[PDB]
Design a protein around this ligand. Structure first.
Ligand SMILES: *[C@@H]1O[C@H](CO)[C@@H](O[C@@H]2O[C@H](CO)[C@@H](O[C@@H]3O[C@H](CO)[C@@H](O)[C@H](O[C@H]4O[C@H](CO)[C@@H](O)[C@H](O)[C@@H]4O[C@H]4O[C@H](CO)[C@@H](O)[C@H](O)[C@@H]4O[C@H]4O[C@H](CO)[C@@H](O)[C@H](O)[C@@H]4O)[C@@H]3O)[C@H](O)[C@H]2NC(C)=O)[C@H](O)[C@H]1NC(C)=O
Ligand SMILES: *[C@@H]1O[C@H](CO)[C@@H](O[C@@H]2O[C@H](CO)[C@@H](O[C@@H]3O[C@H](CO)[C@@H](O)[C@H](O[C@H]4O[C@H](CO)[C@@H](O)[C@H](O)[C@@H]4O[C@H]4O[C@H](CO)[C@@H](O)[C@H](O)[C@@H]4O[C@H]4O[C@H](CO)[C@@H](O)[C@H](O)[C@@H]4O)[C@@H]3O)[C@H](O)[C@H]2NC(C)=O)[C@H](O)[C@H]1NC(C)=O
Ligand SMILES: *[C@@H]1O[C@H](CO)[C@@H](O)[C@H](O)[C@H]1NC(C)=O
Ligand SMILES: *[C@@H]1O[C@H](CO)[C@@H](O)[C@H](O)[C@H]1NC(C)=O
Ligand code: NA
Length: 581
């Protein structure tokens, strides 16, 4: 294909294709030999060896000292201290067992997921497809099933895009740092003890083999691609060889061309291993506090404590999952949710209930989520996420709004995260302090009990503070409620209380983009709908200043502008910093 293994070549790949931006919600699952112990977390293979750890204590009490009863015994099978045979060995329901992958995929489809798939290989050295490059796989050992192909075929049967998650970099960058050294070269491959050049080649070879095997639409990657400092006390670069990373990107993007598919690869947003030119940034167990461009995603888990099933595990509420989805989508991201089957392949009913509830929401209110795009302001209200990876899911109430809009940019969806007891929704960013003219607001509708049904909202007034909307009769109960505001000729450009707005015409009219406090480079402004060379005026809010830069990303000649309206020379702006005074 046309891609070469260089940054410059692979940069030209379209990172986030339109189907992926339309999709919004996906589901994957950490299920593998690391689940076998059903203890602590998916890091059990690492921590069972850790000096003085609870996991080591548990392991020693249950199986044996890890120096004798090593991690590989979960894959190959061994008796525990009470004589019970232990092995990762799911058995299909069609064979009399408890593993029903078809039922799990139907549950996932029912949740509203538009992409789905397995962790194909975590940090633990176990490839879960029929692998020639890695003998540590579930066709050779355990269930004698190509689990990744089974999942992939079922995802395609059920008309979802296929995501495959790969975490095989940390395998040799410290995950197994406390495992005994071995001279068994097969066992070295499991435990990440091969020579580093061989491990770097194996990282690529695993990707190549997997992606030719199941042709994924998205390849999700974990950290240690190039994340120095993130691999704890292990002495190493916490990285994959740069050449092998580039070979992966070129190989996958070339296969995408060959297959006639727009493919996606993701990586952890703090990791430096790929570039946000051609790969999508993934925020782990969290997401930004602000609207971020370019398009990004969250991957979060149904449990706070683990990605993989453990005995006694507790789960987030449906409310937290739906409100968090709305938050990410409003901020220009997708949300990929991890679920956690037990070692025997059963999906616990508490998890099924969460997925069912998400699906009830999306099947009713999907118009406000699927196929939408972020507005320029993501939302309003007192309940907000902290921002960053490893932060708490959102749980909001009737005081909170999240915005989305249609592709035609003349419908604004106002999603309220609870039913207002006062029967009032006040939208601050559509009030007159926001300098919003509502002459073009043609209709306000409440989305009803099933998709495509609307209840007319007849009473509203625009105050200084807000567009004050009086609600019709409460529809069937739901985790959030959606107002649909339809405009003649496009949604108005709001003036943030603190922030700015930029325009394509010289007099603060025309195409516009509202900006919060923050830093907005050429990529941001372009994706928001206004190439910076087309900016011809800016309105800076009270208590705010804006600094215009000629450069792409806060370099070059700069000019500071205080509160008020200002004309801007065509082709003079590349990026903008909006700051509180
Ligand atoms: C005190 O404060 C000062 C000022 O803030 C601190 O200085 C900063 O220190 C940084 C860390 O040393 C330094 O960043 C480095 O800059 C060099 C030159 O620009 C850059 O090459 C470095 O990037 C490499 O290393 C990082 C890990 O730090 C990797 O994440 C990265 O991928 C790069 O790895 C490549 O080079 C390595 C050799 O250095 C190879 O081992 C590695 O395999 C990889 O090689 C591949 O890629 C190459 C291209 O990247 C390619 O040529 C090669 O063939 C392979 O394909 C890193 O960014 C800052 O520049 C520096 N800042 C200033 C202003 O001086 C200082 O740390 C503070 N002190 C303390 C104690 O904290
Ligand atoms: C996609 O990946 C790419 C590639 O990795 C990412 O690009 C990187 O983006 C970085 C963040 O923008 C950028 O760093 C910036 O580079 C400029 C140019 O060297 C530098 O001036 C920036 O430093 C300022 O900003 C940082 C915060 O980002 C501050 O910590 C720092 O003290 C500097 O602050 C000053 O400027 C800011 C404006 O940027 C002000 O907000 C701040 O208050 C302060 O203002 C004073 O100085 C101003 C003059 O500079 C003046 O106007 C003002 O009045 C004050 O006197 C920062 O280091 C990287 O260069 C860039 N890398 C590449 C290779 O392009 C990109 O972010 C990724 N995209 C996403 C979405 O993550
Ligand atoms: C592993 O091989 C090295 C190299 O021959 C040798 O020095 C070491 O003793 C071997 N390890 C064990 C446990 O015998
Ligand atoms: C919603 O949450 C906000 C912030 O905690 C709180 O001030 C408000 O009273 C809550 N609304 C209801 C109806 O509980
Ligand atoms: Na690109």
């Amino acid at each position: 294909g046309p891609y070469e293994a260089t940054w410059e070549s692979t940069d030209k790949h379209n990172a986030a294709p339109e189907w992926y931006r339309d999709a919004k919600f996906g589901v994957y699952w950490h299920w593998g030999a690391f689940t076998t112990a059903q203890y602590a977390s998916e890091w059990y293979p690492r921590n069972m060896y850790e000096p003085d750890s609870d996991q080591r204590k548990h392991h020693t009490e249950t199986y044996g000292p890890p120096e004798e009863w090593g991690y590989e015994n979960f894959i190959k099978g061994a008796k525990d201290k009470k004589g019970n045979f232990v092995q990762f060995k799911p058995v299909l329901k069609s064979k009399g067992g408890e593993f029903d992958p078809e039922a799990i995929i139907k549950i996932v489809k029912g949740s509203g997921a538009r992409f789905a798939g397995p962790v194909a290989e975590h940090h633990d050295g176990f490839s879960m497809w029929d692998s020639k490059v890695n003998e540590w796989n579930p066709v050779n050992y355990g269930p004698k099933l190509d689990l990744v192909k089974l999942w992939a075929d079922l995802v395609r049967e059920n008309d979802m895009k296929l995501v495959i998650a790969m975490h095989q970099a940390y395998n040799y960058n410290g995950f197994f740092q406390w495992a005994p050294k071995t001279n068994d070269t097969s066992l070295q491959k499991l435990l990440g003890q091969l020579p580093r050049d061989e491990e770097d080649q194996l990282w690529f070879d695993k990707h190549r083999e997997m992606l030719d095997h199941v042709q994924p639409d998205i390849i999700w990657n974990d950290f240690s691609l190039d994340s120095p400092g993130e691999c704890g006390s292990f002495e190493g670069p916490c990285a994959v060889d740069e050449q092998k990373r580039l070979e992966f990107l070129a190989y996958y993007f070339n296969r995408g061309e060959e297959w006639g598919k727009e493919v996606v690869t993701t990586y952890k947003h703090h990791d430096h291993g790929f570039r946000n030119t051609s790969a999508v940034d993934d925020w782990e167990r969290g997401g930004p506090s602000n609207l971020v461009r370019p398009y990004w995603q969250t991957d979060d888990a149904i449990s706070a404590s683990s990605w993989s099933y453990t005995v006694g595990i507790k789960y987030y509420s449906s409310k937290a999952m739906v409100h968090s989805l709305l938050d990410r989508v409003s901020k220009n991201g997708n949300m990929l949710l991890n679920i956690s089957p037990m070692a025997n392949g059963v999906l616990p009913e508490e998890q099924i209930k969460v997925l069912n509830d998400i699906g009830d929401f999306l099947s009713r209110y999907g118009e406000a989520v699927y196929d939408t795009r972020a507005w320029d302001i993501y939302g309003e209200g007192p309940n907000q996420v902290e921002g960053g990876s490893f932060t708490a899911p959102l749980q909001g109430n009737s005081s909170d709004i999240r915005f989305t809009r249609n592709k035609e940019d003349d419908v604004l969806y106002v999603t309220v995260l609870g039913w207002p007891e006062d029967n009032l929704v006040s939208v601050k960013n559509l009030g007159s302090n926001a300098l919003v003219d509502l002459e073009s607001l043609k209709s306000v509708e409440l989305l009803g009990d099933k998709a495509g049904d609307y209840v007319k909202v007849s009473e509203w007034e625009q105050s200084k503070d807000a567009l004050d909307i009086t609600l019709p009769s409460q529809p069937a109960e739901s985790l959030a409620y959606v107002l649909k505001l339809t405009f003649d000729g496009g949604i108005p450009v709001p003036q943030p209380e603190r922030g700015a707005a930029v325009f394509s015409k010289a007099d603060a009219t025309g195409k516009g983009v509202a900006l919060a406090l923050g830093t907005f480079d050429t990529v941001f402004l372009t994706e928001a709908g206004l190439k910076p060379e087309e900016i011809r005026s800016i309105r800076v809010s009270d208590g705010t200043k804006a600094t215009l830069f000629s450069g792409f990303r806060f370099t070059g000649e700069s000019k500071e502008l205080s509160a008020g309206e200002h004309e801007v020379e065509d082709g003079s702006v590349g990026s903008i910093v909006v700051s509180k005074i």
